[PDB]
Amino acid sequence: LHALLRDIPAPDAEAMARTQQHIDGLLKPPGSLGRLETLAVQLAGMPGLNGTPQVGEKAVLVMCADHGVWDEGVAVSPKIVTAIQAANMTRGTTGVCVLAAQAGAKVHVIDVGIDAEPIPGVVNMRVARGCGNIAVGPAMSRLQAEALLLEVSRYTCDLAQRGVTLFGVGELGMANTTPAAAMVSVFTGSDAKEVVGIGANLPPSRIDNKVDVVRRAIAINQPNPRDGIDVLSKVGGFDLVGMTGVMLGAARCGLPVLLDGFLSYSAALAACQIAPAVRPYLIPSHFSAEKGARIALAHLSMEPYLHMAMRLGEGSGAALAMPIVEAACAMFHNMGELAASNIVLP
Amino acid sequence: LHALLRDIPAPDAEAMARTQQHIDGLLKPPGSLGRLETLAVQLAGMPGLNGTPQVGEKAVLVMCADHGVWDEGVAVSPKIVTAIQAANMTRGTTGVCVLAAQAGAKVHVIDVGIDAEPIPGVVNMRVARGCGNIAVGPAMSRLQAEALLLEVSRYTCDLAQRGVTLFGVGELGMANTTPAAAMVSVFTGSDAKEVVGIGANLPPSRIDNKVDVVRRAIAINQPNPRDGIDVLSKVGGFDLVGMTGVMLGAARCGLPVLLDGFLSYSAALAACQIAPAVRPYLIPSHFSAEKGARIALAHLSMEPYLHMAMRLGEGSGAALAMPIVEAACAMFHNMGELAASNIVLP
Numbered sequence: 001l002h003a004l005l006r007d008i009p010a011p012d013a014e015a016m017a018r019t020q021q022h023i024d025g026l027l028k029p030p031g032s033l034g035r036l037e038t039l040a041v042q043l044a045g046m047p048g049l050n051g052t053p054q055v056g057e058k059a060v061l062v063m064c065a066d067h068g069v070w071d072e073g074v075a076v077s078p079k080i081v082t083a084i085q086a087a088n089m090t091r092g093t094t095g096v097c098v099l100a101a102q103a104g105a106k107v108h109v110i111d112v113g114i115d116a117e118p119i120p121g122v123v124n125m126r127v128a129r130g131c132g133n134i135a136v137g138p139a140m141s142r143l144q145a146e147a148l149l150l151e152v153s154r155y156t157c158d159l160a161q162r163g164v165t166l167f168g169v170g171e172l173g174m175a176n177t178t179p180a181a182a183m184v185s186v187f188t189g190s191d192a193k194e195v196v197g198i199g200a201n202l203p204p205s206r207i208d209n210k211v212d213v214v215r216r217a218i219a220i221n222q223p224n225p226r227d228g229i230d231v232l233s234k235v236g237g238f239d240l241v242g243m244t245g246v247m248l249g250a251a252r253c254g255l256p257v258l259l260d261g262f263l264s265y266s267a268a269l270a271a272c273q274i275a276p277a278v279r280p281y282l283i284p285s286h287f288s289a290e291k292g293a294r295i296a297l298a299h300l301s302m303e304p305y306l307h308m309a310m311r312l313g314e315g316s317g318a319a320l321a322m323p324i325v326e327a328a329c330a331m332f333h334n335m336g337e338l339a340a341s342n343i344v345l346p
Numbered sequence: 347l348h349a350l351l352r353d354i355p356a357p358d359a360e361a362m363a364r365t366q367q368h369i370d371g372l373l374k375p376p377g378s379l380g381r382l383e384t385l386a387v388q389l390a391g392m393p394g395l396n397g398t399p400q401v402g403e404k405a406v407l408v409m410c411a412d413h414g415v416w417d418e419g420v421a422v423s424p425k426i427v428t429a430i431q432a433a434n435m436t437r438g439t440t441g442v443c444v445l446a447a448q449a450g451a452k453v454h455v456i457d458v459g460i461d462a463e464p465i466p467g468v469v470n471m472r473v474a475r476g477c478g479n480i481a482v483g484p485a486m487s488r489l490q491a492e493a494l495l496l497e498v499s500r501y502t503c504d505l506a507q508r509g510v511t512l513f514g515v516g517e518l519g520m521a522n523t524t525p526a527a528a529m530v531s532v533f534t535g536s537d538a539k540e541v542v543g544i545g546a547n548l549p550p551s552r553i554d555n556k557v558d559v560v561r562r563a564i565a566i567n568q569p570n571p572r573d574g575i576d577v578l579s580k581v582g583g584f585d586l587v588g589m590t591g592v593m594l595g596a597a598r599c600g601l602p603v604l605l606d607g608f609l610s611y612s613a614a615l616a617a618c619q620i621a622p623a624v625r626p627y628l629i630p631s632h633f634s635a636e637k638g639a640r641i642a643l644a645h646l647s648m649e650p651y652l653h654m655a656m657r658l659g660e661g662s663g664a665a666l667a668m669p670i671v672e673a674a675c676a677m678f679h680n681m682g683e684l685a686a687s688n689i690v691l692p
């Protein structure tokens with residue numbers, strides 16, 4: 001694991017200099033394509049991309065798991081929805097499935113801790129039948145967290161071998177916005193009330209209780225903010241852990257990952273805390289309608305491309321952003337050159 | 347023309363009610379897909395769409411023309427760039443071309459007033475060789491404006507006959523951000539300085555002069571804000587006029603149009619002033635990096651989906667947003683249903 005972390009490659013500045021120059025010569029006023037240019041320069045620096053902005057195959061990894069905290073009444077969705085939806089992920093009827101297909105990406109459903117029988121068709125990396133209720137103790141053990149990080153990481157980089165060049169990350173776990181909020185609060189030093197949202201339509205009345213849960217989780221566990229794994233194991237979740245795993249895996253493989261929503265921002269913070277080297281591989285998608293979103297993105301120093309007021313999860317925002325990445329590539333590769341048109345701009 | 351305006355159909359509320367209900371039953375917490383849902387409900391109400399959110403063929407109309415105001419030193423790009431780029435539009439090497447292809451849309455280059463010889467391959471609807479310099483008089487005559495509105499309008503709805511269901515609008519005209527700013531200032535009642543931008547990289551020193559030009563244009567012409575055609579003819583342009591034309595055409599045809607940037611917002615204001623019935627057909631794309639953007643969108647009451655810091659024009663932002671529209675459709679049509687999974691949410 002430390003090995004893994006050790007080997008995360010830094011970006012290729014040489015590739016980035018060549019990209020920039022090229023982009024500057026395209027048929028447009030310099031800098032006119034704004035974020036599209038920056039994006040392209042960012043991809044170019046990703047070692048696994050071969051010195052240029054490009055997109056081969058695409059995949060969205062969906063980490064599924066249940067949470068003990070569901071019993072604290074923080075979620076209106078019935079527990080079994082995790083297991084149900086997970087199965088749906090197999091039939092292509094879910095939102096992430098629909099959007100991935102539209103983007104030509106492949107969805108990978110991973111079971112990291114669903115509280116149900118195993119689902120045929122689902123990748124099994126099950127840690128247990130739901131994680132511990134963070135309200136009265138840790139979600140899991142440190143060893144448990146590390147091992148999953150390792151396993152998901154590997155799975156991730158291995159796909160790289162089969163031609164995947166772009167990952168999208170997502171989750172599925174009833175009541176997951178709770179642990180997500182606790183993480184945010186902890187890494188960010190933000191009070192709970194400031195980052196606790198409605199999740200999957202929690203009624204306004206029920207909020208107060210959700211905030212108390214978060215605070216409790218924290219007081220009880222005393223997670224160390226300077227220790228991302230510590231945080232994850234204590235007030236996180238199997239699914240949060242898996243997401244971070246993808247992030248570490250793609251980074252090690254030198255490839256880009258598209259974040260999703262608030263849950264993903266949560267995992268991102270943890271990943272960045274664990275290995276800052278991860279940062280440059282990360283790519284925001286949309287701006288989640290979850291209350292704690294601005295705080296979280298600020299700490300990440302990220303500005304999403306899309307403003308859709310989405311809050312479904314599953315990696316749906318991720319899938320939605322993929323075309324944007326392809327855009328930047330197309331731009332880089334297919335546009336004509338100023339010089340070639342005898343056009344001179346000051 | 348008044349006929350045309352007369353016949354713009356109102357949206358279909360019955361279709362919209364059925365869409366909403368359907369969306370509410372999909373495999374997700376209600377309202378979770380946010381703006382994606384709203385978008386879909388909006389399409390459903392468009393008569394030319396056949397009571398459902400759908401996308402057949404796609405086209406981006408690019409209105410090209412030169413401006414007399416270029417001689418006021420408001421633009422660093424050489425005049426001939428309009429003619430050059432227009433020709434490039436024919437070879438598929440431009441930014442809009444690259445992005446449209448990525449979206450599977452077809453680009454239509456229309457010459458409405460380029461100051462050059464005719465370009466083979468370019469649709470000719472040339473009013474003249476550049477419009478009048480708004481700084482010392484009107485850009486054109488009212489009759490000239492009306493006729494073009496008519497002609498572009500028709501061209502537009504006619505494409506509808508060949509299976510086009512989604513339009514994207516764009517322009518090409520060196521120095522066009524000037525007339526665009528004047529329009530904004532006029533419809534919005536905003537002072538010039540507040541809405542005048544750097545355009546295609548105008549140096550910071552040169553700004554002051556750009557603002558004076560705008561003010562002059564206004565003082566001299568005295569365009570009536572309550573009369574969109576009046577405004578267009580006076581301090582607008584052939585290209586601004588054409589854009590508005592597309593808008594009126596698609597609306598009459600009962601179809602959706604994706605806006606582009608600041609120039610497009612300009613034309614939009616004019617269209618809405620001319621026929622409010624147009625509004626509901628309009629669909630924002632991105633949030634232009636041009637200074638006058640927020641003011642303009644506020645008056646339009648629109649919130650772009652994309653934040654890319656783009657400022658190239660050509661309808662590039664429009665093309666970029668097309669997949670989003672397809673997303674909403676896919677969502678509507680391909681997602682599974684809650685009931686079907688025996689899932690009950692409060």
Ligand SMILES: Cc1ccc2nc[nH]c2c1
Nearest residue numbers: 027028029546658659660
């Ligand atoms: C090169 C160049 C300059 C200005 C432009 N405006 C739209 N496309 C452009 C291309």
Ligand SMILES: Cc1ccc2nc[nH]c2c1
Nearest residue numbers: 200312313314373374375
């Ligand atoms: C039905 C349902 C409820 C919660 C969800 N979170 C992600 N997908 C979901 C689907």
